[PDB]
Amino acid sequence: IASASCTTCICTCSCS
Numbered sequence: 978i979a980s981a982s983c984t985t986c987i988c989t990c991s992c993s
Contacts, residue, residue, distance in 0.1 A: 982991020 980989050984990060
């Protein structure tokens, strides 16, 4: 639902 760097294609993932 909400995290940093870590889902496959919905909206977050990683980033620093």
